Design an enzyme around this catalytic site. Sequence first.
Site, PDB file in Angstrom:
ATOM      1  N   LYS A 125       0.966  -1.036   0.027  1.00 58.73           N
ATOM      2  CA  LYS A 125       0.172   0.053  -0.280  1.00 58.73           C
ATOM      3  C   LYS A 125       0.640   1.317   0.072  1.00 58.73           C
ATOM      4  O   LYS A 125       1.042   2.059  -1.066  1.00 58.73           O
ATOM      5  CB  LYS A 125      -0.865   0.429   1.559  1.00 58.73           C
ATOM      6  CG  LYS A 125      -2.095  -1.303   1.754  1.00 58.73           C
ATOM      7  CD  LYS A 125      -3.428  -1.541   2.772  1.00 58.73           C
ATOM      8  CE  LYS A 125      -2.160  -1.389   3.746  1.00 58.73           C
ATOM      9  NZ  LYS A 125      -1.576  -2.393   3.895  1.00 58.73           N
ATOM     10  N   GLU A 140      -0.245   5.589  11.162  1.00 66.08           N
ATOM     11  CA  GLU A 140       1.398   4.659  10.767  1.00 66.08           C
ATOM     12  C   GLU A 140       2.465   4.715  11.047  1.00 66.08           C
ATOM     13  O   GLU A 140       2.174   5.309  12.331  1.00 66.08           O
ATOM     14  CB  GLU A 140       1.029   4.912   9.105  1.00 66.08           C
ATOM     15  CG  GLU A 140      -0.308   3.965   8.543  1.00 66.08           C
ATOM     16  CD  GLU A 140       0.116   2.997   8.339  1.00 66.08           C
ATOM     17  OE1 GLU A 140       1.482   1.891   7.724  1.00 66.08           O
ATOM     18  OE2 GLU A 140      -0.726   2.361   8.732  1.00 66.08           O
ATOM     19  N   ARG A 141       3.652   4.700  10.720  1.00 61.03           N
ATOM     20  CA  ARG A 141       5.138   4.551  11.423  1.00 61.03           C
ATOM     21  C   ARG A 141       5.528   6.136  11.084  1.00 61.03           C
ATOM     22  O   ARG A 141       4.903   6.681  10.079  1.00 61.03           O
ATOM     23  CB  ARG A 141       5.888   3.658  10.414  1.00 61.03           C
ATOM     24  CG  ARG A 141       5.172   2.383  10.638  1.00 61.03           C
ATOM     25  CD  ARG A 141       6.030   1.441   9.578  1.00 61.03           C
ATOM     26  NE  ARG A 141       5.806   0.352   9.838  1.00 61.03           N
ATOM     27  CZ  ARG A 141       4.690  -0.580   8.971  1.00 61.03           C
ATOM     28  NH1 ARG A 141       3.533   0.478   8.649  1.00 61.03           N
ATOM     29  NH2 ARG A 141       4.388  -1.582   9.162  1.00 61.03           N
TER      30      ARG A 141
END
Lengths: 470, 469, 484, 53
Positions: free
Chosen positions: A158, A184-185
């Site tokens: 993704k 997210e990260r």
Amino acid sequence: STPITGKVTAVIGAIVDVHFEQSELPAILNALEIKTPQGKLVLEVAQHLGENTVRTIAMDGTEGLVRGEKVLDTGGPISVPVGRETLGRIINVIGEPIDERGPIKSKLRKPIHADPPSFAEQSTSAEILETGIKVVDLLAPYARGGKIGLFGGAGVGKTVFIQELINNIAKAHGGFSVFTGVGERTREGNDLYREMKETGVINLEGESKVALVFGQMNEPPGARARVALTGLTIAEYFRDEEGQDVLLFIDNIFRFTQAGSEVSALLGRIPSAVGYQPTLATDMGLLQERITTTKKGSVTSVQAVYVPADDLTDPAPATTFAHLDATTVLSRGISELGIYPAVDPLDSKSRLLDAAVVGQEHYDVASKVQETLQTYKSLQDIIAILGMDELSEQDKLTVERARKIQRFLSQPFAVAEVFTGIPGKLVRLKDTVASFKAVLEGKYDNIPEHAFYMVGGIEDVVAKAEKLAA
Amino acid sequence: TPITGKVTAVIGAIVDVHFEQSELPAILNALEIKTPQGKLVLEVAQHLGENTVRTIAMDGTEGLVRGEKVLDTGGPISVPVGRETLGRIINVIGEPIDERGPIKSKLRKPIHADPPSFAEQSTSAEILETGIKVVDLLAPYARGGKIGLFGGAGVGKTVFIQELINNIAKAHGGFSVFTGVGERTREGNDLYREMKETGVINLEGESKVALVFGQMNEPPGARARVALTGLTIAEYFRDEEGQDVLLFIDNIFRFTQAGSEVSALLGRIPSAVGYQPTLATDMGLLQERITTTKKGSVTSVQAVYVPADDLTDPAPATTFAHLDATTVLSRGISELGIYPAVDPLDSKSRLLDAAVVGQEHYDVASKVQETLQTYKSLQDIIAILGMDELSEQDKLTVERARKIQRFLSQPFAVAEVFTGIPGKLVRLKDTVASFKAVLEGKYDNIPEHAFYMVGGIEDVVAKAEKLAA
Amino acid sequence: NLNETGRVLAVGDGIARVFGLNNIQAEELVEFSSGVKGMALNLEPGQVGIVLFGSDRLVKEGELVKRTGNIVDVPVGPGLLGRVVDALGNPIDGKGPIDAAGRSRAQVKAPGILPRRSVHEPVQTGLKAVDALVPIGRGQRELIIGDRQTGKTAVALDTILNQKRWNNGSDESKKLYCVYVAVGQKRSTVAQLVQTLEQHDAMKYSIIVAATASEAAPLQYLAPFTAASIGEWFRDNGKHALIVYDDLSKQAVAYRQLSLLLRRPPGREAYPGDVFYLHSRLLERAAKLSEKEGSGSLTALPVIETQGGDVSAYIPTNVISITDGQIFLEAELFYKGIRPAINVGLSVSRVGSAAQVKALKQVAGSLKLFLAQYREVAAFAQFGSDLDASTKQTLVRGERLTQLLKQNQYSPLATEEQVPLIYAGVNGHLDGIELSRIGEFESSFLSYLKSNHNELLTEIREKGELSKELLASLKSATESFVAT
Amino acid sequence: QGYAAEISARRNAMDNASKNAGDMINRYSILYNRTRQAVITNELVDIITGASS
Ligand SMILES: Nc1ncnc2c1ncn2[C@@H]1O[C@H](COP(=O)(O)OP(=O)(O)NP(=O)(O)O)[C@@H](O)[C@H]1O
Ligand SMILES: Nc1ncnc2c1ncn2[C@@H]1O[C@H](COP(=O)(O)OP(=O)(O)NP(=O)(O)O)[C@@H](O)[C@H]1O
Ligand SMILES: Nc1ncnc2c1ncn2[C@@H]1O[C@H](COP(=O)(O)OP(=O)(O)NP(=O)(O)O)[C@@H](O)[C@H]1O
Ligand SMILES: [Mg+2]
Ligand SMILES: [Mg+2]
Ligand SMILES: [Mg+2]
């Protein structure tokens, strides 16, 4: 100032209960503030509990809160700055600059909660957005000012996909972009910000064309539950008041639903199926229906959509499909074979794959590519047990063309160069159609499989074939 | 003068008791209620507030009336310790149940005690020979270690424990403690008689073993504590007498299950599968006491019941990490006539290390496991298509694996009635050389059936000769 | 004075409900008069829900409870090296007081977007299969996952042991300080692990933080967090630390126990709503700082235990989604002779070659893709059909490459030792050697290289790269050995 | 003669394959219905525990 005060009465994790004086309760969705030794803690009002107490959700950690502490009403919902002054800046959930570059000196601020456009305000359109990615352009083309979703389990691609779209679509586009990192990260954030500078999409000492908004997985659930609306409000202002084409990238939208899930029990709710909140679909509705093109302006949105345990029937992604003009479904099975991007060529769909839109020729190649592929999927059980020898004359030929087609659909991305060592390739929609048409007509039957793997258009296939023979 | 309270509430094993003035009995204290039978013992579990305590009964609660007088004893449930307990059968609450009168020991110790600290741990890699081929070869037990026997209903946990007792207890030198937890009273009766005959218990003489029983007919309070009781006796021998103790528990799964019968009545929100939320830490408070320290050594063999043959169940699943060696018994394997039904690929030991057993033993164990795994990986193809569709390597490997698998079966002395054959004890060194040779294809011409239910390679050769007639 | 103290209303199962304590802070440490410490988690209108850091047998109704005015913290600093401590930093090795440089809160915000830089420095595990196929970099989080007894601790342990190579030097920037967190393990198992670390002279650069089976849920919950602040000291001060969370499955179970006993309403499989947050704020703290912040790093090797191979379950899905890659262990591969039992197909490092020695990268070109080609080709041949040059060659090469990557425990290899092995494999110098002999080839090739071509090895170790000349030298050095 | 012998051997192999496989199907259908049942129960249990508070 004419300021309104309450007192903290309860703290259980992210949930904070606050008691105010008579008939001056703040409205649901209001931001409240607490002064903390470091800076300030924001709370968002969620419920009226009765007896003049409201229940709120923290936008930061609650460690260090004391019962009886003064709470300030801000009079309205969490606000974010809007307009050109957000460009080239990183902003958190509560509208505050997190790039150490000073205040965002914008003329207006706007609430992150807004009603979606009315049904009268909708504007339907069948204009194709050429991505340069063979599998997308041929079989499920994206729509200008439309809603695109990238579905995929952990590690299927993704984030790399979304990065490729940014790399191709954003430069060709003339308006503004808004990127929202949701759950997210943080290091993905540090990478994207370093990239934007080197590409020139963000110029620190000049003009910029993209707004960054982050609320990553280090942050508590409430932050993660609201940051998509923060990024959205910025994109809405560009759609409505600026009056121009806007790109809105979101990675990852699942995290909005998950955050919502993480507090739902402490808010006082009986859970729904698979441990999700009972408001899963209406909350998603309120958010998604804002991410849309109207008669006032265009928004093309690309939303990465995480898929729990690879299960596409899981309430969250399952509810997401119908919100989406074109869905790209990434597949572990396809990636495990070494095919990137790992797009499932059968499960990916687009409203735009219609003879009325792409032409009859394009539509026919698409259908026949898909039929070849499905026949191959169909026959895979005869192969696994009885082997290739048992197939019909016409069936052997279909399997050999299918295997080529599977591989031909793979493409070296520019952004994936570190993973492959292969220079990235971008392929025009018209070459994609012509290329696959030729294959289906049998013009390249003598060419071996590996020649179709990880290349560009048909000229590349021919070129690899000659290089492998020599 | 003693502290008294009145019973305010009874729900099953849970009794709530109120105390009139300021002083409330500590958590873990034993309380007492005088019954016409004798006395009922209660153990304080929590302080409810408003001077009320919540207790767990150690027997039936039939007959209790709201308002009844309750006596604080001033401390935890206590058990007799030291040599006086040897050759005796004892209660969860430390009472004699063999009608041989009072256990006149010098000291009584509380059944609850802190596990030995991190500083007090003492570790060693020493093989404990069992004479059981599958264990000795593939997953050897450790002297002073912990050993779990996992198994579903009726696969052979008890008979395995009995064989171990028969092999290692008889000539061990130190003392043994047997704890029956939530199992068959009739097995307790069986055992008692068995010990008397093998002279491990002498009514007139000296005895090497102390018995502690809380069987499956007991209320859940008793089944939840009786293991601590057996354990305290074992700890006295370890620390005070500096001895090598053997602790046999059958069945420890029942400590946990008893714990879950009372969890809801104690007012907890059930965890996964309706177990108590405290499943893991309750298990550590018990398990971490069953250990070897610098003062002395404890070798323990625990039967672990697997509910509904499900090894992922929270009870067995959490037990794994408490064990130095695990032998997992399998219903699939026992339905094929292979006993002991050990799973040669799921049974594990910390000691299967070349540094402990030598390179040759390790190498043989490895290659046995390879062979069997190759056979396992082919189950599906075999079941549908059969032997004819295998390649030539595979057909050889499978043919050999079918023998190794039969060769891992063994006649047990205690199971003599079911096998029809005298029991065999095979030595570790014999087991290593036997399997070594099979792996070398030196017995490939020998029919499978000759490997079944015998001792070492000699027995194989002897059986192959008989069948040729 | 009810502001700084309160009284116990009710107590049980490691939870105490306390009246008073009006000025207490959420998550503040408290002292019970009877001895035991505790943490304030639920601040409610009438009372305070407190989770104890020990036994509760000694607490009673009416008992006085006392503020500390501190959010739960722990001692930090180089003083901790070579020591074994509990969740709260108290020494449990019996070697006296810890000297601390300062104190850090248990819960600390992760480094934001700005103070970071791309991961670019190898964490050399010395494991051929990891270092060649799934390279770990300084600042990365790499999950080790598998069923019980599959080699999960063995992978972190060998990594720690292999830092011996730099930790004896005087170059601080190439050093890696190790922190090992034992959650839910039994004391004998941790005792056994410190003993191995001593026998390898690895204890002198490790810190063990232990919250074992017998300790209270809230200690087990807390241990990873306080261990991270210990690791963070190295990170914040321009050094590098590697932290092993063994294991997060057990920490989640402990968090689930606290919450149910506090009567917080459960979520899926009875875990708290925010079990995903528990790990995500834990692991985002592992990071690689920017130059402006002194380039220190913290690297996490979280461990997760599956059941029945099911990597699709609740907690494993959560963690897999947090980390930058996974190493996947399997019983089947273990018994097949593949040790460490790493499933290559499923196993990824996302930093990839950005954080791998160039020499190692050069030689392991497409080794991963090739081993995938081998998996495909082997799956096919199981149809008992005859084969051609192409299929028989790769089936030969892949079968030897798999064998090449098998490695004994406690036996980590240097990069200069790994390079020539991979090289001999990938280019095909092993292809005409019997499969059973690959083990002995490894040691003999190295012994040959250490005697004759020792200059070659030095170039590899000191430059970390292979010039066109080095490749040619290595080509000829291998061919020479292939025939005795 | 080898052909006719082979085809008769393949017919009988495919016969036992079909029969063995049709046996597995039965055993797996039953495992399937157990598991389908257990998923409904276990999912209900969480829903119910969450509704007790
Ligand atoms: N186009 C590509 N070419 C080659 N490898 C790729 C490609 N895209 C993804 N990968 C591989 O997939 C890994 C993860 O890609 P990424 O886009 O981060 O997956 P993701 O689905 O966003 N994972 P997550 O965000 O954890 O759910 C990379 O490190 C590569 O190994
Ligand atoms: N070593 C053995 N040899 C032959 N038969 C055995 C052996 N062990 C067990 N059996 C058979 O299995 C039955 C039960 O063995 P037992 O040791 O009671 O198993 P178990 O798992 O303890 N049963 P339970 O405790 O009720 O779940 C016996 O009646 C025997 O028929
Ligand atoms: N490379 C290797 N070669 C051979 N044996 C190994 C190797 N690595 C580990 N082992 C052994 O395999 C067993 C399991 O290793 P271990 O690291 O304890 O796995 P684990 O997954 O942490 N098990 P646990 O915590 O007990 O569930 C031990 O006996 C190790 O000594
Ligand atoms: Mg991603
Ligand atoms: Mg039994
Ligand atoms: Mg481990």
